[PDB]
Amino acid sequence: DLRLHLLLNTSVTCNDGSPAGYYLKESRGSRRWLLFLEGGWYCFNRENCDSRYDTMRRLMSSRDWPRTRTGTGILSSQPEENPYWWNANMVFIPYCSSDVWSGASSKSEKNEYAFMGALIIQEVVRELLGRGLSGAKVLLLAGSSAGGTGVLLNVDRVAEQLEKLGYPAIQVRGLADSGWFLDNKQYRPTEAIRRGIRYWNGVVPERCRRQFQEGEEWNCFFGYKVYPTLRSPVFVVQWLFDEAQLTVDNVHPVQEGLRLYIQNLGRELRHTLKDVPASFAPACLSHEIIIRSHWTDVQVKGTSLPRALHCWDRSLHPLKGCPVHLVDSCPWPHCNPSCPT
Template identity: 30%
Template sequence: MGVLQGTISRRVLDLDLTIGCFTLSLKPLGSSKYMERQVPFSGILSCDPAQNPDFFSWNKVKIRYCDGASFAGHPESENGTGLFFRGQLIWEAVMHELLSLGLSSAKQALLSGCSAGGLATLIHCDDFRKFLPKDATVKCLADAGFFLDEKDILGNQVMGSFYRDVVQLQGVAKSLHKECAARMEPYKCLFPREIIKNIKTPVFLVNPAYDIWQIQNILIPDASDPHHSWQNCRLSIHKCNPSQIATLQGFRSSLLEALSEFQKNKEGGMFINSCFVHCQTWMANTWHSPKSPRINNKTIAESVGDWFFNRNILKQIDCPYPCDRTCYDLDFT
């Protein structure tokens, strides 16, 4: 009976995920049919030296989100849903196209992304390095992609279950580190905590300690708050009561604990600020402006530039909320 219940549960989860993917395929994040034809390049993609002091003159390419698994899906067979998950092949096709357009002769290259793109950056970082000349300076910058395998406020392992289903549905295991996938359940190797243990290319991590997406989807998903007692806190950290702040501090502690090994990485950089936000590298207000978040009086752009050009490799960790008055906190109330 226990096995039967487990089987039904798995099928329900797979069905929910498939329905979610189908819904996404009808929106800009799931199909090029619905994407904007032009997108603004700001923050790290900006051509304005005042906004992007170190990388304004670089050639820049934005790879659009479309596959739902950080360009890592590659199932062995079709799933009968009419949906095709080929993120790994999309990644390879894009890279070969860029190499033919001049990337193959690059002297300096930085692979970056935020959110699912930040996770994609970590997954493909070493692969990106292999595509480029051996004498090129190649590094990777992951913004808000350090997703945690934490329990929600009711004790449910929401993100772990979701990752397990994504790996199964999209055949992601083949894109993950082989030794890791042989040592533990493959879905666990999709979490950045495990990924960064095996990356050889220099990596910089930008992550808010109170990542709004993770707060709303991992720590306090809608289903874990049926009485809406967390509603205001989920929308604005300034509306949290002391007990809720204590829970958020625990989430921050989990992030720092997950990063403890990376702090020993001599080539790695880090900017962990105490802001209630998600992606920070692609917006001028958070990347580099007079009102940008700072740690030790350094903006994210200055910290990343110092790291990339070996001027100063820092691992900056902010003091806990509410000490940082430079934060660009989101407020959805």
């Protein structure tokens, strides 16, 4: 169980002005820290944010949050559930900003909602330094779905923040799960992200912003475009046939047209990962994995995800029998026998 702490700086808020926060389980004998970003889509104007507030309110407010949460998957402390980092200090950061963790805008007389995702991450890091993070050797910023995209948008800013605060020896790294999307042709959101950035006062990494420039910052929400601009090591986990990708593409006895569409999506995803040295991409139809209790079950080329992450750790000190780049080559969902049922 991880215990809730609401942020002492009450100007850093969820969508409705209530305080943001984090859940924490400390491990006194460890210098590794795992900060996980929750996912859950986003909203991009007054009307669809109002709808979200009616029936997805825990993603917009802390008023009804429970005081504890059970750590699962990579946030579990049991070695049998989490062979990778079971003895680490564990942090779960709830997603209550509806902005893919990019926003920097307060609620005010002209803004019905606050969008403070980028500032929530910075404030969590600041307040954790007084609770033991000042002694860390590695800070892994991880996340799933919108939280995986949030890793890509924020990992280098966390590294810069710790450098400027006088902690140049903490190694900052990223783990992006199910946040690597393609701005492809639909079978039957670039615009929704463009509108969202203006609504949220969204911020993107500096080098990516300089490449694409004003009005085109939406490009930096797409992994294959923002990843080459990053300096921190990032490990990319992505199902080749991601369900959120297919939903946006308007895909739901498969005939030739849809067969070719689905095979081309897998091929394109594989192509964007060809030069990503730390990656895990199985040929499955699914969505998210790293905080699932059965995350230990899937394998690519005989290597599990916890093993690949451990091999990544060793590489940051090629390794015999300890691979870090694992991408399936077979071209149809569930051609990998270990896919989630």
